[PDB]
Structures are given as structure tokens and as C-alpha cells.
Amino acid sequence: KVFGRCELAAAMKRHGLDNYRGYSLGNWVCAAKFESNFNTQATNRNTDGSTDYGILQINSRWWCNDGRTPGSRNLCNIPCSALLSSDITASVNCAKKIVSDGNGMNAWVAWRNRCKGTDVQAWIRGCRL
Numbered sequence: 001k002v003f004g005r006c007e008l009a010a011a012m013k014r015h016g017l018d019n020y021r022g023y024s025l026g027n028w029v030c031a032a033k034f035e036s037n038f039n040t041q042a043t044n045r046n047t048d049g050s051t052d053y054g055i056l057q058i059n060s061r062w063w064c065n066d067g068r069t070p071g072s073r074n075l076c077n078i079p080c081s082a083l084l085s086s087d088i089t090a091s092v093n094c095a096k097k098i099v100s101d102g103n104g105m106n107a108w109v110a111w112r113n114r115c116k117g118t119d120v121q122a123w124i125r126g127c128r129l
């Protein structure tokens with residue numbers, strides 16, 4: 001599913017991401033924009049052999065199991081395929097664990113490079129929330 005901007009913001013709000021670990025909703029919408037262009041089915045292979053999955057491009061080295069990342073962990077306890085669902089529940093639950101891991105949203109390099117320090121509230125401007 002490709003979410004609309006305001007549709008995703010609403011879905012992330014319902015699932016409890018708005019201000020989660022102090023990150024306003026616009027941060028999460030910005031991150032999703034640059035990670036996946038709001039496409040739940042986005043996948044991307046990394047040079048280390050891991051793969052990033054879903055709307056927030058969650059990586060198989062630590063977070064999910066895909067059966068093909070040697071030596072990896074599955075800390076969210078999910079198949080990486082669950083992160084591609086039209087229902088974002090799994091991606092949100094896993095994102096909350098990731099952002100709690102010590103570096104906050106710096107865990108998402110695209111967040112750090114494209115969102116951090118910018119006017120992120122623009123990503124939710126105009127939405128009925």
C-alpha cells in the first residue's frame with residue numbers, strides 16, 4: 001500500500017508514534033517519506049547482505065527475520081515480511097523498540113540526513129488529526 005501523507009500521519013498517531021520517545025509526528029512522517037515514499041512494500045538490499053523492509057525500512061541485521069542474513073538477530077520477533085503489510089502495526093511496534101535503542105531516530109540514517117534539524121511539522125501541516 002502506498003499511503004497518502006495525511007493518511008499515514010493519522011495511522012501513526014493512532015498507533016502511538018506521536019511524541020514517542022519525544023519525537024513529534026512530523027519526524028516519523030518525514031522519515032517514512034525518505035525511507036519508502038510511504039510504500040509499505042518497499043524493500044532494499046544493503047551492502048552487508050541485510051535487507052530493509054517496509055514503510056520505515058527496518059533492517060534484518062537486528063530487527064526481523066528473513067532467513068537470509070547470516071549471523072543476524074530478530075529483536076522485534078517477527079518475519080520481515082510482516083513489515084510489508086498494508087496494516088502498519090508491526091512496523092510501528094518494531095520502530096518503537098528501535099528508537100528506544102539509545103540513538104533515538106539517528107538509527108534511521110535518512111532521518112538524520114534529511115529530517116533532523118528541518119521544519120518537520122510541515123509533513124503534518126494541513127492534516128486533520
Ligand SMILES: CN(C)CCN(C)C
Pocket residue numbers: 033034035036037042
Ligand atoms: C526519494 N525519497 C522519497 C526517498 C527514497 N524512497 C523513495 C525510496
Ligand SMILES: CN(C)CCN(C)C
Pocket residue numbers: 005122123125
Ligand atoms: C513538501 N513537504 C515539506 C510538505 C508536504 N506536503 C504539504 C506536500
Ligand SMILES: [Cl-]
Pocket residue numbers: 024025026027120121122124
Ligand atoms: Cl511535528
Ligand SMILES: [Cl-]
Pocket residue numbers: 065066067068069070071072
Ligand atoms: Cl537470517
Ligand SMILES: [Cl-]
Pocket residue numbers: 021022103104105
Ligand atoms: Cl532521543
Ligand code: NA
Pocket residue numbers: 060061062063064065066067069072073074
Ligand atoms: Na534477522
